[PDB]
RNA sequence: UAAAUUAAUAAAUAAUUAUUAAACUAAUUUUAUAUUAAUAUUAUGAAAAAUUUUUUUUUUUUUUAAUUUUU
């Protein structure tokens, strides 16, 4: 069941606005999309293949 | 528990709210165990009729696998069984 | 109209609630003796309890009609799968064999509920209360109980609903079945 | 439940069989419920129903452009009255109404492989407008009495309601005994339709 | 024959397999009453000898 | 979001349920304070699961032991701990630099 | 009599207290509770642009992990007023259920409310109530089910002295009960007909069946058999009743009723784990740790102590059998001794008018046969017997021919259920029951409206949508105009839609026979109108 | 039954972590180290027709005198001298041989170097990471055919083969594991 | 056997074919039915108008076999 999470939320610099920091980035990890989990981890599998 | 609102998102982001305990280590396992999925928290069952939910992937994928003709008719487009044979193939590219 | 019957308690004890022709008659309970077979009143008295998660069929007595009532003879019944009477299932996976013949479970007296099997070692899911002294019955259908209440009923069934080839005349079914004690 | 104001089916003065113009009509009530479609309580063809207004009504005649003709309710009356609307509301849906048709036809069709029969067309009537039909009440035009319909396009023909005179219905329609059924052949595929 | 119709072509076989397996056991509980009622007299000739 | 800089205090779980399972088994001695030499010598571990610093002591799934019971592990849990005191037994912290762990584990 | 179904949906009953002080409990008001955020809103500098991290000039922008933790925000006591005399609304929620929630979020011990359970009496009816306890005010809505459905929710009206503890929890005068019919039979007339005859005749005023249990094994089946010197026969009886309450109890007990000689106290041991996971007032349940104590002093006698059935049911939770549902059986059982004596005319016979004397008035007119039969025609109300062994105590109509048809029976071996304690230390020797317990009696202000074509359903708009609909709650008899609900397809759910069709293909008839009364304290409402409808559930 | 609001805390073991005191009411603890048994797996052994009547669950516990009695370790009368290996809070216990005195059960299974039993849940490929599990059964001796049988009686519906040295049960995962270990402990085993 | 498609704070699955594995119950003929997971595989390319013929690419050998009438 490896899932792998990246930090989520957008990451904009805007200007000296962002007025709130309380409902700023919730400072969630959400797991990546599942194809692309595949995708990095097809990378590690071939250390031994067959 | 049954919900009878709006009900919520999980608890990725917590404000914890202690009753009583050793306690000095709330919010430490309280985002440990919330970025895995989890319980340690206790979860919160609500939306007791998640059964429109397994009837939508139901039809949401009973009628988008019928977009390519469902076809309980055959080996599509048969026409030379019905005499008699094992069909053999034809490789797609396409 | 009495049955005579043998008294023991730490046994367990199944309820069934008959209904012929559409009409509540009332409920039958029976102790299963545990004491000389234990495996045959366990595979019973679970399809009457309906605790077992369905296999081959759903385990439960609850719905399926008596089928073979022979008046004065026996009346069967049991039948989970096929409500008909064709097929014997066991909530072990497999048709299981007879344990004891030798006390309590040879003699078919009138107040007992033989355990009817396919083959004569292969036992399954269809049982049959035994109405008069079957002096043949002996050591060949695994006696497994006995009626303790109810025995009005099931001479109201083989009655009737009844036929010398077995068909009932009208269907008489277990409207609900349960552990009493 | 009687729906609360989904429905509200309210006696009548005028015009229903709606149309572009669809009063054409002398002189009685029938309507279809006014539930939203109390519309129609807004300047007439329809009158909540009082204790009074179970008695009689003051229909639309159009004699005088007005609901001018007084109307009883009796048993006669609304015994006349469906027996009046029902005759025109299948004149009303065969005349407006278009049956298409998917039929088969073989090659570079311009034709039917299996021409039309009559009783053929009255499981149409029946089936798209529910108008029930005798199907000997359907003549064909007179270029096709001998083959069928058999063509494709749009063709029309002749279904005849007799019952014009017993229900005294003229100069509102423009046909007192027969109405002109207007058809459309298609030439769907095997996949399409039977025949 | 060609018992019913189940779904898959798997629970098609994964149900043939066990009417396959019903007749394994249906043999070797058969061999196990053998083994089960020679003990019990067997039992008792132990018994039976200290009565 | 786990960079394993040098220094950073990440041991090699040892549950005490494994450890409780070879001094019955007969692997360790129950009169001896039971230290990493033995554990490794005992095959009670493998050597690979030692890397600096050298373990813990987690006591999940346990609930008493019954038992006296003197070790020498680096920070065992806190109800690993408390296991271990209320058995009459006692544990130790023997929390040390690398070449502490080489000159003990090959004495 | 006409049919009648009935407790389909939770609030097909509705019930308020109505207190001897007078007014009764209405509830307008519903505070969700007030907090404290103790820390501050822990965040974190999390890069916000994709520039590497040698750059000086790098974002950072801050992303919140904790908001910070809060406290219940405890209160003060006024100077001297320890009491709370607070209304609350319990939705479905037995007593039990709400004893224990105020000690899974506050932690008031069970000895400090005081909440006189209304009688009928059934659990899963919607209620409003008075309690006295002894928190603070700014506590007690951190108790209350707010945001959820059935809203069980506590508000204040409170802080009496501790003198002021017997004058309050005295007793509730009346109760309102406003009921509402389902798949009824008798069209509009038929219903009007039955119900004057029960607003006026009256009603047999029994004990209702719930303070004995719904249940193949009633609470005197307890009572009796702790005391038939067989323990082990109450244990089973009290575990049964579990098995038969709750989905969550009954396969342990059938694991556990029917398990091994060999592997018992495990199936106590995995039916203890289960009713500890599943949090249950894990205190006041110790029974089943005894059980798995009495079945582990066997299996290794020698190993774990030595425990008796007898031990086992000590530590039970009794009280609710022994006094008040024992001595409900046979009370009943002395009303069928007053209509076999047939009582409508009250049957003196010798001129033994009631002395319960019932302050300066309420005698029953004590008379001649004619001059009693002033009043006592009329009065036919009166109380029948005590509960349980006073019945000798008043045993007042009759000659106590009813009693002398008893009492040769009941202290020989309990009449009805042929095994009871009357022994000489009993309810005679205690003073705490009273009864008043009248015979006949007759709902009060009756006369509530009838629907003849509800084809489907109904709801009954109750006091927590009222007081949210900016609505004065209190209407002290069937509105209609609020609280009613005639039929539009919003009976508050779509399952209970699949519960009126697979209940109308059994029992069939139009319905929503809307109902109202202000029965006095007893008389549960099912046993009143028991006669004038045929309930069904 | 929504009227209890809670009950909430009985919620799931898939989809959610699952550790410390929400553990699942019907999965097993067994573990490789912790042997620890249940009753409810052992009525599913003792309520099934086999032969080889298994141990009693009352002579099969490793787990339920100078100071008011003394451990199972033997501790001696002085409180002084106990012996080594006579208790075990992990579970542990050697075999206690067949309950039948009359039987020649026709398998004798080979606890390994460290007193487990031969059961391992291994993965059908494992580089995929697939959640398609089975067993194996490594130390089996004796007529391992006749072992073959009884695990029938027990897995019906498992396809279970069977060579020299091992038996592969296929499709079952770490619970049919502890299952195995009831029937090997009460087998006298 | 043509199906898939949302750049970017808390919304159940891309789709295909492929390899390898998995489970039958409120849900009827005593009918019928290829669902699920893991991994491998994302380029087969329409612009306007109008609108709310047909099943065939693929056969072990001997027979057997129902779709024909001209202007």
Redesign the interface.
């Known amino acids: 069941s490896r899932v792998w999470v990246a930090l989520g939320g957008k990451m904009r610099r805007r200007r000296i606005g962002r007025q709130i920091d309380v409902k700023d980035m919730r400072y969630y990890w959400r797991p990546i999309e599942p194809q692309y989990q595949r995708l990095y981890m097809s990378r590690l599998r071939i250390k031994d293949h067959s | 528990?049954?919900?009878?609102?709006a009900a919520a998102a999980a608890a990725?982001?917590?404000?914890?709210?202690?009753?009583a305990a050793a306690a000095a280590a709330?919010?430490a396992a309280?985002?440990a165990?919330?970025?895995?999925?989890?319980?340690?928290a206790?979860?919160?069952?609500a939306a007791?009729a998640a059964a429109a939910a397994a009837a939508a992937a139901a039809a949401a994928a009973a009628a988008a696998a019928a977009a390519a003709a469902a076809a309980a008719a055959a080996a599509a487009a048969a026409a030379a069984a019905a005499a008699a044979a094992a069909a053999a193939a034809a490789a797609a590219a396409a | 109209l009495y049955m005579p019957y043998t008294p023991v308690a730490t046994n367990p004890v199944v309820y069934f609630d008959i209904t012929a022709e559409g009409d509540a008659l009332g409920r039958v309970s029976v102790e299963l003796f545990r004491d000389v077979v234990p495996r045959t009143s366990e595979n019973f008295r679970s399809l009457c309890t309906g605790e077992r998660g369905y296999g081959q069929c759903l385990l439960y007595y609850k719905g399926t009609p008596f089928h073979r009532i022979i008046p004065g003879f026996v009346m069967q019944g049991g039948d989970i799968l096929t409500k008909d009477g064709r097929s014997n299932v066991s909530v072990f996976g497999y048709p299981f064999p007879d344990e004891s013949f030798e006390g309590k479970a040879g003699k078919h007296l009138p107040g007992t509920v033989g355990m009817a099997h396919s083959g004569p070692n292969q036992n399954g899911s269809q049982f049959f209360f035994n109405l008069g002294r079957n002096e043949q019955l002996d050591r060949k259908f695994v006696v497994v109980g006995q009626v303790l209440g109810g025995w009005e009923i099931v001479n109201q069934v083989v009655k009737l609903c009844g036929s010398r080839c077995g068909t009932p005349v009208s269907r008489a079914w277990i409207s609900d079945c349960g552990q009493s004690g | 439940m009687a729906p609360e104001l989904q429905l509200e089916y309210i006696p009548i003065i005028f015009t229903r069989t709606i149309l572009g113009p669809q009063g054409g009509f002398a002189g009685e009530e029938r309507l279809i419920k006014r539930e939203v479609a109390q519309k129609y309580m807004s300047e007439g063809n329809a009158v909540t129903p009082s204790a009074e207004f179970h008695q009689g009504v003051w229909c639309y005649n159009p004699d005088s452009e007005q609901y001018d003709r007084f109307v009883e309710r009796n048993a006669e009356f609304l015994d006349f009255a469906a027996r009046k609307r029902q005759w025109l509301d299948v004149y009303w849906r065969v005349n407006t109404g278009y049956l298409l048709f998917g039929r088969q036809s073989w090659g570079q069709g311009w034709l039917l492989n299996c021409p039309l029969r009559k009783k053929d067309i009255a499981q149409k009537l029946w089936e798209q407008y529910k108008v029930r039909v005798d199907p000997r009440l359907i003549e064909f035009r007179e270029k096709d009495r001998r083959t069928g319909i058999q063509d494709l396009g749009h063709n029309w023909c002749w279904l005849y309601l007799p019952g014009a005179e017993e229900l005294a219905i003229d100069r509102e329609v423009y046909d007192n005994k027969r109405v002109k059924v207007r058809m459309h052949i298609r030439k769907m595929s095997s996949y399409g339709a039977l025949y | 024959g060609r018992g019913g119709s189940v779904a898959n072509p798997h629970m098609r076989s994964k149900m043939n397999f066990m009417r396959l397996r019903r007749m394994r056991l249906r043999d070797v509980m058969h061999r196990d009453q053998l083994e089960k009622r020679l003990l019990e007299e067997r039992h008792h000739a132990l018994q039976q000898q200290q009565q | 979001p786990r960079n394993r800089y040098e220094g950073k205090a990440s041991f090699s779980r040892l549950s005490l349920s494994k450890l409780l399972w070879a001094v019955d088994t007969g692997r360790l001695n129950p009169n001896e304070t039971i230290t990493l030499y033995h554990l490794r010598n005992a095959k009670v571990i493998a050597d690979r699961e030692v890397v600096w610093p050298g373990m813990v002591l987690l006591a999940g799934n346990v609930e008493r032991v019954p038992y006296p019971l003197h070790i020498e592990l680096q920070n065992a849990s806190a109800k690993a701990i408390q296991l271990l005191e209320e058995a009459g037994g006692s544990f130790t912290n023997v929390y040390m630099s690398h070449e502490g762990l080489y000159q003990e584990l090959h004495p | 009599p006409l049919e009648a179904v009935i407790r389909v949906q939770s609030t097909d009953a509705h019930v308020t207290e109505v207190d001897a002080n007078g007014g009764g409990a209405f509830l307008e008001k519903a505070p969700k509770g007030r907090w404290r955020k103790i820390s501050r809103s822990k965040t974190l500098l999390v890069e916000d642009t994709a520039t590497p991290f040698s750059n000086s000039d790098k974002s950072f922008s801050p992303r919140v992990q904790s908001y910070g933790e809060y406290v219940r925000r405890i209160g003060k006591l006024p100077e001297g007023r320890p009491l709370l005399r607070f209304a609350m609304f319990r939705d479905g929620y037995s007593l039990d259920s709400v004893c224990h929630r105020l000690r899974y979020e506050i932690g008031v011990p069970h000895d400090g409310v005081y909440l006189h359970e209304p009688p009928g009496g059934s659990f899963a009816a919607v209620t409003q109530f008075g309690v006295a306890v002894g928190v603070t005010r700014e506590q007690l809505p951190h108790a209350s089910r707010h945001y959820n459905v059935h809203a069980l929710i506590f508000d204040d009206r409170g802080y009496h002295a501790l003198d002021e503890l017997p004058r309050l929890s005295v007793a509730p005068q009346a109760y309102l009960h406003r009921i509402l019919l389902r798949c009824v039979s008798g069209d509009e007339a038929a219903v009007a007909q039955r119900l004057r005859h029960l607003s006026s005749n009256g009603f047999i005023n029994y004990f209702g069946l719930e303070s004995f249990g719904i249940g193949s094994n009633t609470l005197f089946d307890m009572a009796a058999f702790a005391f038939r010197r067989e323990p082990h026969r109450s244990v089973g009886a009290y575990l049964q009743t579990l098995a038969e309450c709750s989905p969550l109890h009954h396969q342990p007990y059938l694991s556990y009723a029917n398990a091994e000689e060999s592997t018992v106290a495990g199936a106590v041991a995995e039916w203890l784990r289960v009713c500890e996971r599943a949090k249950l007032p894990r205190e006041t349940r110790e029974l089943l740790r005894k059980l798995h104590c009495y079945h582990l002093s066997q299996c290794h006698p020698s190993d774990a102590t030595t425990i008796s059935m007898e031990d086992v049911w000590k530590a039970c939770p009794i009280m609710h059998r022994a006094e008040q549902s024992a001595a409900a059986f046979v009370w009943n059982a002395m009303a069928s001794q007053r209509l076999l004596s047939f009582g409508s005319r009250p049957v003196k016979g010798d001129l033994v008018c009631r002395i319960g004397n019932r302050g300066a008035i309420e005698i029953a007119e004590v008379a001649s046969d004619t001059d009693a039969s002033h009043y006592t025609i009329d009065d036919v109300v009166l109380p029948i017997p005590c509960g349980g062994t006073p019945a000798a105590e008043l045993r007042y109509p009759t000659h106590s021919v009813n009693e002398a048809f008893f009492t040769q029976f009941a202290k020989k071996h309990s009449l009805s259920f042929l095994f009871n304690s009357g022994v000489d230390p009993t309810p005679r020797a205690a003073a705490t029951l009273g009864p008043y317990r009248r015979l006949v009696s007759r709902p009060r202000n009756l006369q509530a409206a009838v629907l003849q074509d509800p084809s489907s359903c109904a709801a009954l708009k109750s006091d927590l949508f009222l007081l949210q609909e900016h609505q004065p709650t209190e209407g002290w008899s069937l509105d209609y105009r609020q609280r009613v609900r005639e039929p539009s397809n919003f009976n508050v759910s779509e399952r209970f839609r699949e519960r009126m069709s697979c209940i109308r293909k059994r029992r069939a008839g139009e319905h929503s026979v809307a109902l109202a009364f202000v029965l006095p304290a007893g008389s549960s409402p099912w046993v009143a109108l028991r006669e004038a409808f045929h309930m069904h559930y | 039954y929504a009227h209890t609001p809670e009950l909430r805390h009985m919620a799931d073991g898939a989809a959610m972590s699952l550790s410390g005191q929400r553990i699942p009411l019907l999965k097993p603890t067994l573990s490789k180290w912790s042997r620890q048994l249940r009753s409810d797996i052992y009525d599913e052994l003792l309520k099934l027709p086999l032969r080889y009547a298994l141990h009693d669950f009352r002579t099969l516990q490793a787990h339920i005198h100078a100071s008011s009695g003394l451990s199972s370790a033997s501790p001696d009368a002085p409180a002084y001298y106990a012996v080594a290996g006579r208790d075990s809070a992990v579970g542990y216990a050697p075999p206690l041989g067949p309950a039948d005195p009359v039987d020649v059960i026709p398998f004798f299974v080979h606890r390994s170097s460290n007193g487990h039993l031969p059961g391992k849940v291994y993965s059908m490929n494992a580089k995929t990471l697939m959640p398609a599990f089975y067993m194996r059964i490594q130390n089996i001796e004796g007529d391992m055919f006749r072992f073959e049988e009884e695990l029938m009686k027990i897995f019906p519906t498992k396809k279970i083969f069977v060579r020299s040295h091992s038996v592969y049960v296929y499709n079952v995962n770490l619970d049919g594991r502890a299952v195995l270990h009831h029937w090997l402990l009460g087998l006298g085993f």
Do not use: K, N, Q, R
């Open positions: 528990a049954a919900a009878a609102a990725a982001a917590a404000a914890a709210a202690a009753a709330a919010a309280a985002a165990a919330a970025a895995a999925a989890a319980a340690a206790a979860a919160a069952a007791a």
